[PDB]
Design a protein around this ligand. Structure first.
Ligand SMILES: Nc1ccn([C@@H]2CS[C@H](COP(=O)(O)OP(=O)(O)OP(=O)(O)O)O2)c(=O)n1
Ligand SMILES: [Mg+2]
Lengths: 391, 549
DNA sequence: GTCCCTGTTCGGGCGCCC
DNA sequence: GGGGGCGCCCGAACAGGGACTG
C-alpha cells in the first residue's frame, strides 16, 4: 500500500523539454526502458499527460553498463516537503542504492508527474513517453518514502559495526570508517553482501586561504593591485586595513615606478597577512537557505571555489587542480564540490557557473558520473574576483 | 474505416465550457464541398448528426489542397483550443534526408484520410459541434483544427507501428504524421513482401494506404525533397522579385533563404534581416539598403547553381568545416568524403552587446554540434579557419570555461583572429593615464577625462550621458591622446569588463571607436583600482571630472 | 532605494513538413 | 479565416549586478 504524496501548494508539475541525445545514450535508454517496462516499473503513456522531465544516461568507468538518469530537479523543487562525524572518517565509500527504490510502488495520483520522453535519432519517430509506477531514482520523495525500510536493512550492520557511519542522500549511500584501506574495503563488501541479501577521504579536504604577494621591490602597479585586493577582502575580513599602503600611492605616478615600503606600510601588510589566517567569523550554516557555490577559472587547470549562503559569509573556500578540456574539468569540479557539500552539510549547492549556457549544455553530460544533479545558473565572472582568489 | 484503437482521454481546462461561437458566411462552392464531405463522413460514422441537446458550436470552412482536386475540411477551433487541456507534444523535430543511410529498397506510403481514421474521446465529442449552413454535426474522429489532433495522431500511429517495428527490427520506418518512408536491405522482391505486410498491419488498425500515394520508384517525394538512390535534392526554391518590399515580404524572403541554406552553401541574411529592425507592422514598406539589395543579389546567384546532398555512411567520419563570412556571419558544410556534402548551413545570431570572432566561432561550433547530434547522434570532427595558437591564446586569457571539440586548422581566409592583445604587465616607457568619468543622473550632464604622470590633464564635458558612458569615454580619450604604448588606470568594473574580453565588434558606436584605437596601438595595459579611496592619482582625476556634477 | 546595462525567455511574424 | 512540429529573426518583458544619493 502506497504513501500519498503531493505537490507544494500552487505548483503544477514539471514541463521541461527533452534535449537531444547521442545514439549511444538512446540505445542504452531504449534497452533499459523496455526491460523496466517488462518488470512493471514504468508504463507507456500518451500526450494527454502534459508533464515532462529530461532523461539521459551515463556509462561508468571502464564498464559496458549504462545508468539511466532522470533529471528530476524541477519535480524535486515542486515536491511537497545529518551525521557530523561523516566528515572526519579517513575513508568514505559511496554506493549506488537506487535499485532498492523499485521495490516500493508509487502513489497513483503522483505517477503522472514523473513522465519522461525518449527521442529518436533524426526524429525517425515521435518521442516515446513513459511514467513511473515505483519510486523513481533521483526523486527526492524516494529516499523519504523508503527511509523506514532502509533503517531496517542497515540496523544489524550498524549495531555490529558501531564505528562505521552510514549516510544516505538520494540514490547514494555514504559509508565512512577509520579502518585501514583493505579492512575498510572488506567492510564495504560486507555491506554490499548484506544489501544483496535483501574512494573519498574527507580528511584531505582543505581550505584555500586568500594569499598576499611577498616580494623585495614593489612598483606602483604592484601596490595598486594589492590595495584593490585588500579592499575587496575587507568585506570578508573586516580586520583588513589599507591606509598606510594607500598613502604610498600619493601623487600621480608611473605604473612601473618602484615604491620603497615604509615601516608602517610594511607593518600593516604584516597584520593583514595574519588577519587572513583566521577563520571567517560569524558564519552559521542555515538549512532553510540554499548553499551557493561560485567557481572561478584560474587557468592552468586550476579552479577556485567558495561556498556560502550570504555574500562574503563563506562556509568553505577551496581549490581544484587538474592535468586540456575546460568544460570537462568544470564538470568534474562541480561534482567534487557537490560531493563535499553532501558530506559536510547533507545538502546540494546551487552553482554559479563561469561558462556560457549553450557551451555547458552542449557537453556537460559527457563528463557526468554522479546519480544526482545540482541546481545551477550561468554567470560571467567579473575578472576582478578571478584576481582575488588567485594562486 | 475507423481504427479500433483505444481513444485518448481528454478534458477541458477546469472551470471552462465548450465554445458557443456562431457559424460564419460561406461561399456556395465551399458549402457543396462540405456537404459532399459531410454526407460521406456521416455515412461512415466519422460524424454524427446532433440536435438541440448540443449548445455548442464552432465555425467551419474549407481550403483546396495541392492535388487541386480535393477539398480539405477545416474547423476554426481557436476558441475550443484555448479551453482544451495541455498536451505534451511528442514530435520533437523534423527528420532530415542527410541523416538517412543508403538503403537497398525504399517505399513512401501516405495514409488515407488519416485523422478521420482515429476515433475521438467519446465524452469530448460534444464540444466539436459544428453547423454546415444551407445540418448540425459533431465529430467522432479527430478534427483538423483542434490542437490535440497532431499529438494524438502521432502517438496513436506510434502505438500502431510498434508491433511491426518489434517484429521487423531491421526495416526502417521514418514516420512523419501520416507519411511513411520505409527502407530495407532486402532485394526488391522480399522488400515488396514486407511492404504488403506493413500495409495489412495498418489496414487491420483501420489505416488505409491508397496506391495513388504509394511511391515505388526513385526519385521519391519525401518531406519537401526528391530522394534519388545516391543523392537528395531540395524541391526548387523560388525567391520573389518585387520592387516594393514589405516587412511581410522581407520576412517571407528570409525564410526561403534560411530554408535554402541547408544545402546551398554561402547564403547570407544579415543585411536583409536588419531591415526588419524597429518596424511597426507587416504592412510596412521598407527600402532595400544598398548592402541589402547587394546581399539579395549574391544569394540570387547562389540559388541559380545546381546542388545536391548525399546520404549518411556510419562507417566514415562526420566532418564539419566552417567559413567566416564577415559581420557575425558563418557558413558550414558537413561531409564525410571531400566535395560531397551531407548538408550545409549558416550561423548568424548576434549574441551580446560586445563580442569577437573567436566567441562567435565557438557559438557556431556549438550550434553545429547540437545539430549533428539530432541528425546523426554524434558529434562531427571540425575543420576551422583558426590557428591552433590563436585558440590557445584565447583559452589562456579568457576567464571563462570554453572548449571546442576535436578540430584541425584549414587555411581558408578570412582566418579568425584576435585583433589586439592587452598586456599582462604594466609597460615601461609608456605614459600612465589615470582616467575617470562622472555624470549627473538628473541633468544627464557629465565629464570624462584623464590625468597622466607626465603632467597632462584634460576634461571633456558631455551631454545626455550616463555614468558608464562617461567611463568608456575617458578610456577613449586616453587612447586618442596617447602614444603607441599606453598604461591606463580605470576604476570601472564596467569598462574593464568589456575591454578585457577583447571585443572586435559592438552594438555601441563608442565601444567600436575604442576598439579601432586598441587595434592601432602597439601595447596597451589596462589596470583597475577601487574608486573614491584616495588612490593617487585616480584621486586627482576624480576631482577634475566630479567638479560641477 | 534609482538608473543603467546586460543577459535570458518568450511570443510574434515568416519558412518548411503533414 | 484552423492545427502541431522544427528553424530564423525581432522586440518586449523581466532578472541581476554595479554606481550613485546624501
Ligand atoms: N494543412 C494541414 C495538412 C495536414 N493536416 C493533418 C495532419 S496530416 C493529416 C492528413 O489528413 P488527410 O488524410 O486528409 O491527408 P491528405 O489530404 O494529405 O491526403 P489524403 O490521404 O488524400 O486525404 O492532416 C492538417 O491539420 N493541416
Ligand atoms: Mg494522407
Amino acid at each position: 500500500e502506497t504513501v500519498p504524496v503531493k505537490l507544494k501548494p500552487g505548483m503544477d508539475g514539471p514541463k521541461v523539454k527533452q534535449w537531444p541525445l547521442t545514439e549511444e545514450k538512446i540505445k542504452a535508454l531504449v534497452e533499459i526502458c523496455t526491460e523496466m517496462e517488462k518488470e512493471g516499473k514504468i508504463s507507456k503513456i500518451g500526450p494527454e499527460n502534459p508533464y515532462n522531465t529530461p532523461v539521459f544516461a551515463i556509462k561508468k568507468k571502464d564498464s559496458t553498463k549504462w545508468r539511466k538518469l532522470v533529471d528530476f530537479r524541477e519535480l524535486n523543487k515542486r515536491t511537497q516537503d545529518h551525521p557530523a562525524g561523516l566528515k572526519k572518517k579517513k575513508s568514505v565509500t559511496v554506493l549506488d542504492v537506487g535499485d532498492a527504490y523499485f521495490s516500493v510502488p508509487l502513489d497513483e495520483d503522483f505517477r503522472k508527474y514523473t513522465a519522461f520522453t525518449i527521442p529518436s535519432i533524426n526524429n525517425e519517430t515521435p518521442g516515446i513517453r513513459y511514467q513511473y509506477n515505483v519510486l523513481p531514482q533521483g526523486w527526492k520523495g524516494s529516499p523519504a518514502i523508503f527511509q523506514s525500510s532502509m533503517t531496517k536493512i542497515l540496523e544489524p550492520f550498524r549495531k555490529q559495526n558501531p564505528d562505521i557511519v552510514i549516510y544516505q542522500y538520494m540514490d547514494d549511500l555514504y559509508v565512512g570508517s577509520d579502518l585501514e584501506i583493505g579492512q575498510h574495503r572488506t567492510k564495504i563488501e560486507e555491506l554490499r553482501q548484506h544489501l544483496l541479501r535483501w574512494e573519498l577521504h574527507p580528511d584531505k579536504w582543505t581550505v584555500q586561504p586568500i594569499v598576499l604577494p611577498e616580494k623585495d621591490s614593489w612598483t606602483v602597479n604592484d601596490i595598486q593591485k594589492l590595495v584593490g585586493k585588500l579592499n575587496w577582502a575587507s568585506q570578508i575580513y573586516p580586520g583588513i586595513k589599507v591606509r598606510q599602503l594607500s598613502k604610498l600611492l600619493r601623487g600621480t605616478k608611473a605604473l612601473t615606478e618602484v615604491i620603497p615600503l615604509t615601516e608602517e606600510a610594511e607593518l600593516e601588510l604584516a597584520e593583514n597577512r595574519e588577519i587572513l589566517k583566521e577563520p571567517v567569523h560569524g558564519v552559521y550554516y542555515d538549512p532553510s537557505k540554499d548553499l551557493i557555490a561560485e567557481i572561478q577559472k584560474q587557468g592552468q587547470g586550476q579552479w577556485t571555489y567558495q561556498i556560502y549562503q550570504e555574500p562574503f559569509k563563506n562556509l568553505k573556500t577551496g581549490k581544484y587542480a587538474r592535468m586540456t578540456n575546460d568544460v570537462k574539468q568544470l564538470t568534474e569540479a562541480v561534482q567534487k564540490i557537490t560531493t563535499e557539500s553532501i558530506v559536510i552539510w547533507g545538502k546540494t549547492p546551487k552553482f554559479k557557473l563561469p561558462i556560457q549556457k549553450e557551451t555547458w549544455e552542449t557537453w556537460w553530460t559527457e563528463y557526468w558520473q554522479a546519480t544526482w544533479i545540482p541546481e545551477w545558473e550561468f554567470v560571467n565572472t567579473p575578472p576582478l574576483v578571478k584576481l582575488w582568489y588567485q594562486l | 474505416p475507423i481504427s479500433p484503437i483505444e481513444t485518448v482521454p481528454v478534458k477541458l481546462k477546469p472551470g471552462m465550457d465548450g465554445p458557443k461561437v456562431k457559424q460564419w458566411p460561406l461561399t456556395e462552392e465551399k458549402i457543396k464541398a462540405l456537404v459532399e464531405i459531410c454526407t460521406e463522413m456521416e455515412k461512415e460514422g466519422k460524424i454524427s448528426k446532433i440536435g438541440p441537446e448540443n449548445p455548442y458550436n464552432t465555425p467551419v470552412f474549407a481550403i483546396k489542397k495541392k492535388d487541386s482536386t480535393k477539398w480539405r475540411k477545416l474547423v476554426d477551433f481557436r476558441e475550443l483550443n484555448k479551453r482544451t487541456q495541455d498536451f505534451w507534444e511528442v514530435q520533437l523535430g523534423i527528420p532530415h534526408p542527410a541523416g538517412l543511410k543508403k538503403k537497398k529498397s525504399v517505399t513512401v506510403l501516405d495514409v488515407g484520410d488519416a485523422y478521420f481514421s482515429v476515433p475521438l474521446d467519446e465524452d469530448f465529442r460534444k464540444y466539436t459541434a459544428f453547423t454546415i449552413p444551407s445540418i448540425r454535426y459533431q465529430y467522432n474522429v479527430l478534427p483538423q483544427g483542434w490542437k490535440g489532433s497532431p499529438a494524438i495522431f502521432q502517438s496513436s500511429m506510434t502505438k500502431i507501428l510498434e508491433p511491426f517495428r518489434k517484429q521487423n527490427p531491421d526495416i526502417v520506418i521514418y514516420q512523419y504524421m501520416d507519411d511513411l518512408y520505409v527502407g530495407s536491405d532486402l532485394e526488391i522482391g522480399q522488400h515488396r513482401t514486407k511492404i504488403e505486410e506493413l500495409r495489412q498491419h495498418l489496414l487491420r488498425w483501420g489505416l488505409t494506404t491508397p496506391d495513388k500515394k504509394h511511391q515505388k520508384e526513385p526519385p521519391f517525394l519525401w518531406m519537401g525533397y526528391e530522394l534519388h538512390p545516391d543523392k537528395w535534392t531540395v524541391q526548387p526554391i523560388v525567391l520573389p522579385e518585387k520592387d516594393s518590399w514589405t516587412v511581410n515580404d522581407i520576412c517571407k524572403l528570409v525564410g526561403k533563404l534560411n530554408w535554402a541554406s541547408q544545402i546551398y552553401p554561402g547564403i547570407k541574411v544579415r543585411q536583409l534581416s536588419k531591415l526588419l529592425r524597429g518596424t511597426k507592422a507587416l504592412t510596412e514598406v521598407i527600402p532595400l539598403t544598398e548592402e541589402a539589395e547587394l546581399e539579395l543579389a549574391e544569394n540570387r546567384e547562389i540559388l541559380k547553381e545546381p546542388v545536391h546532398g548525399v546520404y549518411y555512411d556510419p562507417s566514415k567520419d562526420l566532418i564539419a568545416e566552417i567559413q567566416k563570412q564577415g559581420q557575425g556571419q558563418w557558413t558550414y558544410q558537413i561531409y564525410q568524403e571531400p566535395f560531397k556534402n551531407l548538408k550545409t548551413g549558416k550561423y548568424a545570431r548576434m549574441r551580446g552587446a560586445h563580442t569577437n570572432d573567436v566567441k562567435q566561432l565557438t557559438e557556431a561550433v556549438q550550434k553545429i554540434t547540437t545539430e549533428s547530434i539530432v541528425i546523426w547522434g554524434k558529434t562531427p570532427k571540425f575543420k576551422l579557419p583558426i590557428q591552433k595558437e590563436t585558440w590557445e591564446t584565447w583559452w589562456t586569457e579568457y576567464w571563462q570555461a570554453t572548449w571546442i571539440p576535436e578540430w584541425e586548422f584549414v587555411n581558408t581566409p578570412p582566418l579568425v583572429k584576435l585583433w589586439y592583445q592587452l598586456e599582462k604587465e604594466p609597460i615601461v616607457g609608456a605614459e600612465t593615464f589615470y582616467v575617470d568619468g562622472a555624470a549627473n543622473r538628473e541633468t544627464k550632464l557629465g565629464k570624462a577625462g584623464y590625468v597622466t604622470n607626465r603632467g597632462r590633464q584634460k576634461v571633456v564635458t558631455l551631454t545626455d550621458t550616463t555614468n558608464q558612458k562617461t567611463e568608456l569615454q575617458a578610456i577613449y580619450l586616453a587612447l586618442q591622446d596617447s602614444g603607441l604604448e599606453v598604461n591606463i588606470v580605470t576604476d570601472s568594473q564596467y569598462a574593464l569588463g568589456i575591454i578585457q574580453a577583447q571585443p572586435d565588434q559592438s552594438e555601441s558606436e563608442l565601444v567600436n571607436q575604442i576598439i579601432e584605437q586598441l587595434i592601432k596601438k602597439e601595447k596597451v595595459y589596462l589596470a583597475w583600482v577601487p574608486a573614491h579611496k584616495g588612490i593617487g592619482g585616480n584621486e586627482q582625476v576624480d576631482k577634475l571630472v566630479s567638479a560641477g556634477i
